[PDB]
């Protein structure tokens, strides 16, 4: 019902380095075209958290807007990576990949984007952990997002933040204490500036609406950059008009209007409650990982 889900905040770049052969429709994602790195995020029933905050950035978008850094190394060569630590981290994370993908990406324990990739003519197995060659396969040109998450820019320092969960020995690759039930649990997490992955007992989010540029979707459908729209008390490259939210902060002309700007439902600054403090995270998401808990 939202016709502007493909009108992305920031640059809207949904490609991964090395796989640039879908740039026509992924750089940027926009109204027209299909993008194998992005479209799966809008399949109803899948990625519910992102679909509730769909006007925030995807992981690839955050990376290309310099909000999230790339892991070092940026990828794990699954064909020959057995025994390496990047395969170790990926293996504790229960994931499902659809067929025909040669890459999948995720936010790792250091709060950086990592990926697993397969050599030419190979695709990821269903668990996203290995590679196989299917003789009848039309391979995608993008990377599959492994986690249900969303991102935003933030300067809020999270250096003193760390994972704290009641009676948990280990969560994913994080050993919280010395120690036991063991199970695959869907754990929420957040990443903050200068922090690592912070797993959470509970996901407590609140959204503060605002009139920042990323809270608006503009069109001429064809996307339009709001930076050309003059603020109230300013001038710009073009002339614009919008809804009540837009006109409260921008100069609405309503005559010779080059673009129309609406307020994006599901934008604004998200804040998360971590150990009784509200903080502004860089990314927030869910992932299915091994959790070991104390019976005692």
């Amino acid at each position, epitope marked *: 019902e939202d016709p502007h889900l493909r009108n992305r905040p920031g640059k809207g770049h949904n490609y991964i380095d*090395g796989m*640039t*052969q879908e*740039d*026509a429709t992924c750089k940027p994602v926009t109204y027209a075209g299909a993008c194998s790195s992005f479209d799966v995020l809008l399949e109803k029933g899948k990625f519910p958290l992102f679909q509730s905050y769909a006007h925030h950035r995807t992981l690839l978008e955050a990376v290309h807007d310099t909000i999230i850094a790339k892991a070092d190394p940026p990828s794990c060569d699954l064909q020959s990576a057995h025994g390496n630590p990047c395969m170790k981290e990926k293996l504790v994370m229960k994931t499902h990949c659809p067929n025909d993908y040669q890459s999948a990406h995720y936010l790792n324990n250091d709060g950086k984007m990592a990926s697993v*990739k397969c*050599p*030419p003519k190979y695709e990821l197995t269903e668990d996203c952990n290995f590679c196989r060659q299917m003789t009848g396969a039309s*391979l995608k040109k993008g990377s599959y997002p492994l986690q249900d998450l969303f991102c935003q820019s933030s300067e809020d320092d999270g250096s003193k933040l760390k994972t704290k969960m009641k009676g948990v020995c280990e969560v994913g690759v994080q050993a919280l204490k010395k120690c036991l039930s063991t199970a695959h649990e869907v754990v929420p997490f957040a990443v903050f500036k200068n922090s690592k992955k912070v797993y959470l007992d509970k996901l407590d989010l609140k959204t503060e609406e605002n009139l920042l540029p990323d809270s608006f979707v503009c069109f001429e459908l064809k996307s339009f950059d709001i930076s050309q729209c003059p603020k109230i008390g300013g001038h710009g490259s073009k002339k614009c008009t919008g809804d009540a939210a837009f006109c409260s902060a921008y100069e609405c002309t309503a005559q010779y209007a080059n673009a129309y700007c609406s307020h994006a439902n599901g934008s604004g600054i998200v804040q998360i409650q971590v150990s009784g403090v509200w903080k502004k995270p860089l990314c927030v998401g869910y992932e299915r990982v091994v959790v070991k808990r104390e019976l005692s």
Partner: antibody
Amino acid sequence: VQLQESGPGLVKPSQTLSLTCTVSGDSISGGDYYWSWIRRPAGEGLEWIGRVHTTGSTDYNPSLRTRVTISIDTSKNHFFLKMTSVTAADTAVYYCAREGDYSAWFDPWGQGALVTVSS
Amino acid sequence: DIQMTQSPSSLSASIGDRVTITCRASQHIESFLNWYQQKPGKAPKLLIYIASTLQGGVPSRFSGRGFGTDFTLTINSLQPEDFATYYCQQSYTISPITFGQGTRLEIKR
């Protein structure tokens, strides 16, 4: 699939270098490939000029983005390079190529067209 | 730009020898590194793509390896027709695609 460059071998300084690449075999229309131009300047290595998608989207080398226009006519299996305000530094062998499906490697290549910039 | 540096810039080797060509990227490019061979009077031709996958029809004496910043093209049993200039090329970024400066292979006889 086979590629072939064609065009004038002599361009005067400050004028416009134009080249055409002809693709043989099946039609590029409907396909999803990128198509690149590469050159080997006189006494130098290889330099990527830019690329155009089957649908018309383009990407250019940043050091050449102001002088280069690459376009495609999929109904005739052609794509085109235009470079304005050429100087002797643009004397080179120019190659067209089809890009890889999953990453921007180059296969196959054209035969190469020598273009000399001179009065 | 991602700078691609090849080593050696030139070398002379005898028929039957092993020739080793190294390519260094100025940053991590995973396996997105491709190798081309250009014989005299001919256009470059793809030899190896994504670091180690051989182009169809290329003989088994050509092989490639590498991941990250250090890549290696190996020609076992050098043959007289292998006289050429060899180039590496990163396909990690298109702004711009960059090539190595080339390695010229001479036949010693």
